[PDB]
Paper text:
The bacterial Tight adherence Secretion System (TadSS) assembles surface pili that drive cell adherence, biofilm formation and bacterial predation. Here we use cryogenic electron microscopy (cryo-EM) to reveal the architecture of the RcpA secretin in complex with TadD from P. aeruginosa. In summary, our study provides a molecular mechanism for how the TadSS secretin RcpA assembles and is coupled by its pilotin TadD to the outer membrane.
Data collection and subsequent processing steps showed that most particles fitted a C13 symmetry model whilst a subset (~5%) exhibited C14 symmetry. Working with the C13 symmetry bin, a map at 2.7 Å overall resolution was obtained. Map quality was sufficient to build a structure for the RcpA secretin between amino acids 131–383 excluding disordered residues between the tip of Gate 1 amino acids 242–255 and the S-domain between amino acids 381–416. A focussed refinement using a mask that enveloped three RcpA subunits and three TadD subunits yielded a TadD map (termed TadDFRmap) at ~4 Å resolution which enabled a TadD structure to be built between amino acids 29–212. The resulting RcpAstrep-TadDFLAG complex structure was 188 Å in diameter with RcpA forming a classical secretin-like channel decorated by TadD subunits around the outside face. The RcpA channel was partially occluded by a central gate with a 31 Å diameter opening formed between the tips of Gate 2. Above the central gate, the inner lip constricted the channel yielding a 62 Å diameter lumen. TadD packs around the secretin periphery with neighbouring subunits forming a circular filament where helix H2 in one subunit is positioned against helix H8 and the loop connecting helices H6 and H7 in the neighbouring subunit. TadD helices H3, H5, H7, H9 and H11 form the central groove and interface with RcpAaa412–416. Conserved TadD residue R79 is oriented towards and stabilises RcpA terminal residue D416, whilst TadD D139 is positioned stabilising the main chain peptide N-H group of RcpA S415.
Residue numbers in the entry:
A (entry chain D), D (entry chain B), E (entry chain a): 28 to 212
B (entry chain C), C (entry chain A): 131 to 241, 256 to 383, 412 to 416
C-alpha cells in the first residue's frame, strides 16, 4: 500500500496535473509537477510517465528510483515499456510479467504484457494476458483487437468472426486489426 | 429518444484567515500598576482601600492564552494567526421523461425542514431536438447557532447555496448557469494614545483583529438524451497495439 | 400479461476521515507558565494575587486524551485520526395491476412520521407493451439530534435519500434513474504567531482539524411483466454432464 | 464451520470477484484475488476454482492445501473434478462421495457424484445421487437430463417419457439428452 | 415427553427438512439432515424415516437406537413397518400394538396396526384398530377403505354399502377397495 497522502492544497494540484496529462498537455503537466515538491512519490511517478511519453532520457531513472517505493508496480511497468521502446522484448516481457503480478487488476498492464508475450512468442500466455485485459475493460477497445489480431496470426478466421459478432466490431476497427496483425511478428 | 438525463456539477472553494493579539499585566509591592487591554479587565474589581485587586482574571477563548506569574509581575497574552480551507463537490444525476417533473434528495430532515443535496428539474425536448431545462439545484448543510421556541428547540442554521433558472441547450452542450467570486476583509486596531506609537515597545500597547475570507462557486448543467439499458445488459454497480 | 412487478435496486457507499491535535501545559515553582490551546483553558481562572490557578482542567471529548503530571510540569494532549465506512443495500419489489397505484413500507413510525424503506409507484402497460413507470423510492433512517416542543419531544432527525420521476421502459429493461457522487473537505490550522513556524518544535504550538467525506449513490428500476403462480405451484419460501 | 470473516473493505471486493467469476472473467477474477491477501481461505478456494477451470497446474495444490481447513468440502470436490478431468474415475468417485457427504445439500456436488458413479458403474448409487441433485435443484437443468440419460442407458423408455412429461422437457434438451446418454459408458 | 428443543437457527432448518420430506425429496431431506448434527433425536428419527422409505439398510439401527429415547413410539412403529416390509407379520403386530399404545392418537399408527391385525387374523381387533384410525382422521382416506375391505372380506355387503353411503365413497375408491380386499388374506 501507499501510506502517503497530500493536503487539499497540493492534491487539488495533482488533480490539475492529471487534467493536463489527459488533455495532451503532458509538458504543462511536467511544469506544474516541477512546481510541486520533488521527491513526492505521486509527483515522481507522474513526472516519469510524462518523461517516458515525451521521449526524455530521465524517465528511466525516475522509474528506477520508484521501483524501491510504494510506486513499485508502475515503475516496473515503465521500465518494461522502455524496454519495448528500445525493442528489447526479452527483459520487457519479464518486467511486464512482474508488474502485472504485483497489481493484477490494471487493464493497461495486462494489455501491455499480452503484446509483449505475443512479440516474444508465448502465444498461449499472450492469449491468457489479452483475455485478462479484455475482460477487465468494459468490452475493451485495444484489448479486443489485441485478441482479434492474435487470432488472425493464429489463423482461426471463424473464431475471429465469432468475436466480430460478439464484440460487434466495425470495419473501421477491422482495418486496424489487420494492420496490427501484420505488426505482430 | 424522448428521455433526458441531466448532469449537474457543483464546486465551491473558500479560504479564510484570522489574526489577533493583546497583552495585559499587573505589578505589586508598595506600588501597584495595571494595564488591561480592551475587554480584558472586566472580570475584576478593586477594593475601596486600594490594598489589592478583588477579582479573578479570565482568559480569551478564541486564541492561544499564555500567562506568566513572576512573583510581583503577572502578565497575560492572547495571540492567534489561523487559516482555513474548505472544498465541496457534488455531481447529482437524474433521469426524467420529456415534459415530466422530477425531484431528488440526498441529505436529510430535521425537526420538518430538508437539507443536503437537492435537485428539482423539468426537461422538455423540443421538435428541433434541443433541450429546454427548468432546473433548481441546491447544496445545503447544517450550521450550529441560534435557537427557537416553536416548532423546534435549539434548531441549527443552514449554510445554503442554491440556484433557479431556465435555459435551452442542445444534446451534450453545457452552461455555467451560476457563478460567484467573493472577498471580505475586516480590520481593527486599538492602542493606548501616546504609548501605542512607540516604534518598538508600542506593540505591547496595541490590540489587533483581522478577518479575511474568499470564495468561488460554479454550477454547471449538462443534459443528455438517453435510452434504457437492454434486457441483457449488465447493470452498473459499485464496489503497435500498446496502450502508449 | 397486464400485471407488472417492479424491482428497485439502491446502493450507497460513504467514507469519512477525521484528524485533530492540540497541546497544553503548565509549570510551577517560583515562576509560573501556561500555554492554553484554543478552547482548552476556558475552564480556569487565576486569583488576584497570582499565587496559583483557581480552576480545574477539563478534557476534549471527541479524541484520545493523554495527560502527564510530573511534579512541577503538567501537560495535556488531545489527538485523533479516525475513519469510517458505511454501506447500504435495498432491493424492494412490488406487484401491481396496470393503471393501479401501489405502496410499500418496511420501516416504522415515530411520534406520526414514517421512515425506512418506502416505495410508491404506478405502472402503466402501453399498447406497444412498453411500461411507463411513475415511481418514488425512499430510503431513510433515524438520526439523533435536535428537539421539539409540539407534536413530540426530543424527536430525532432523519437521514433521507429519495427520488421521484417518471420514465418509460420495455419489459426487462433498466434505468439508473438517479445517481450521485459527492466530496467534502474542511481544514483549519491555529498556531502561535512566531513559535508555530519553528520547523520541528512548531508542532507543539499548533492546533489542527481535518474533516473529509465521500459518497456515491445508485437507484435502479427494472419492470417485469408477470403472471400468477399456478394453483398447484409450490410457494416461494424463506429458511459430459458435469457441472463444469 | 468457517470462523473467518472479512471486512467491508475486502469483502466488498470478494463480491466483485464473484461477479467476475460468473461473468466469464475468471482470469480477471484471478487478478483481483491476487490483489487480495494470499492465505485467505475464501480467496484461496476461489483462486483454486479459477485455476482448475482455466487449466492451470496449481489448482491441484490449492485444493490440496484447503483440504485441511474449513474449506474441506470444496477442496475434496475440486480434487475429484481433477481426477475426472484426468479420466481416473476410480479415485474421483471416492473424493466426490466424501465431498457430497461432508456438505450434502450442495446440488453441484450431488450431480457431479452421480455422474462419477454412472461412469464407474454403480448405476443404483448413480440414480440415488442424481435424484438427490435433481430434488435439491428447483426442477433441475443438468440433473434432469442426468437422470433421463441414465434411464436411457437403462432402457426404461416409458419411464423416461414419464419424466419428459413431468419435467416438461423439450426436444432442444432431448438432443443433448441422447448425446450425453451416448457419452456415458 | 421430549425435553429437547432446537434453536431458531437449526429448527428453521428442520422446517425445510419436513418440506423436503413431504415434497418427495426424501433424499435431499437426508442430505440436509446430514448437514444438521447427528445424535439429535429429531434428526435421528427423520433420517430413520427417510432410510426406511428409500430402502436403506440403516433405518433398522436408527429405529433401534431411538427405542431407548423420547422417540420411542415412532421407533417401535418403524421397526413394526420394517417387519411388515419383510412380511414377518408376527412381530410386526406386536410392535404396532406397542406403538399404538404408547402414543394412541396417532392415526397413522392405528391404521397400520389394523392392517397388521387383519393380516395376522385378529379380525375383531383389526376392526377395533381400523375404527380408531377412521375416527381419528377427519373422515379418513386410507382408514375408510381399510374398514370397507375388511367388511368385504367379512362378506357384510350391505354394511359395506351403508358405509359407501355414509362416507360418500366413489367408484374411483371402490376399485381400490376391492383390490385391497383381495390383497388382505
Amino acid at each position: 500500500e501507499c501510506s502517503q497522502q497530500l493536503g487539499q492544497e497540493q492534491e487539488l494540484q495533482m488533480n490539475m496535473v492529471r487534467d493536463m496529462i489527459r488533455e495532451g498537455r503532458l509538458h504543462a503537466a511536467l511544469a506544474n509537477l516541477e512546481s510541486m515538491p520533488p521527491g513526492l512519490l505521486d509527483v515522481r511517478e507522474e513526472r516519469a510517465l510524462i518523461l517516458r511519453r515525451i521521449g526524455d532520457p530521465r524517465a528511466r531513472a525516475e522509474y528506477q528510483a520508484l521501483l524501491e517505493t510504494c510506486k513499485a508496480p508502475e515503475a516496473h511497468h515503465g521500465l518494461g515499456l522502455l524496454a519495448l521502446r528500445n525493442g528489447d522484448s526479452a527483459r520487457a516481457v519479464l518486467e511486464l510479467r512482474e508488474a502485472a503480478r504485483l497489481r493484477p487488476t490494471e487493464s493497461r498492464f495486462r494489455n501491455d504484457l499480452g503484446v509483449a508475450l505475443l512479440k516474444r512468442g508465448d502465444r498461449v500466455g499472450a492469449r491468457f494476458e489479452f483475455i485478462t485485459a479484455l475482460e477487465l475493460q468494459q468490452g475493451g477497445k485495444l484489448p479486443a483487437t489485441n485478441l482479434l489480431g492474435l487470432l488472425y496470426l493464429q489463423g482461426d478466421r471463424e473464431d475471429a468472426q465469432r468475436l466480430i459478432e460478439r464484440l460487434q466490431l466495425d470495419a473501421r476497427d477491422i482495418r486496424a486489426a489487420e494492420a496490427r496483425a501484420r505488426s505482430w511478428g | 429518444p424522448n428521455q433526458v438525463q441531466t448532469d449537474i456539477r457543483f464546486v465551491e472553494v473558500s479560504r479564510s484567515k484570522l489574526k489577533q493579539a493583546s497583552t495585559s499585566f499587573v505589578r505589586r509591592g508598595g506600588n501597584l500598576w495595571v494595564l488591561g487591554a480592551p475587554g480584558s479587565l472586566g472580570d475584576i474589581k478593586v477594593n475601596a482601600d486600594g490594598s489589592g485587586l478583588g477579582g479573578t482574571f479570565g482568559t480569551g477563548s478564541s486564541g492561544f492564552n499564555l500567562i506568566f506569574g513572576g512573583g510581583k509581575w503577572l502578565s497575560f497574552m492572547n495571540a492567534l494567526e489561523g487559516s482555513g480551507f474548505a472544498y465541496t463537490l457534488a455531481r447529482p444525476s437524474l433521469v426524467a421523461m420529456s415534459g415530466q417533473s422530477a425531484s431528488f434528495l440526498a441529505g436529510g430532515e430535521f425537526p420538518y425542514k430538508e437539507f443536503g443535496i437537492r435537485l428539482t428539474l423539468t426537461p422538455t425536448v423540443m421538435n428541433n431536438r434541443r433541450i429546454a431545462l427548468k432546473v433548481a439545484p441546491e447544496v445545503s448543510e447544517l450550521d450550529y447557532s441560534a435557537g427557537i421556541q416553536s416548532g423546534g428547540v435549539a434548531v441549527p442554521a443552514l449554510r445554503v447555496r442554491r440556484t433557479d433558472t431556465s435555459v435551452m441547450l442542445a444534446d451534450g452542450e453545457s452552461f455555467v448557469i451560476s457563478g460567484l467570486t467573493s472577498s471580505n476583509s475586516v480590520s481593527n486596531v486599538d492602542k493606548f494614545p501616546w504609548l501605542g506609537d512607540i516604534p518598538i515597545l508600542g506593540a505591547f500597547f496595541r490590540s489587533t483583529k483581522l478577518d479575511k475570507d474568499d470564495r468561488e462557486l460554479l454550477m454547471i448543467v449538462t443534459p443528455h438524451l438517453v435510452q434504457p439499458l437492454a434486457a441483457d445488459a449488465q447493470l452498473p454497480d459499485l464496489p503497435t497495439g500498446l496502450s502508449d
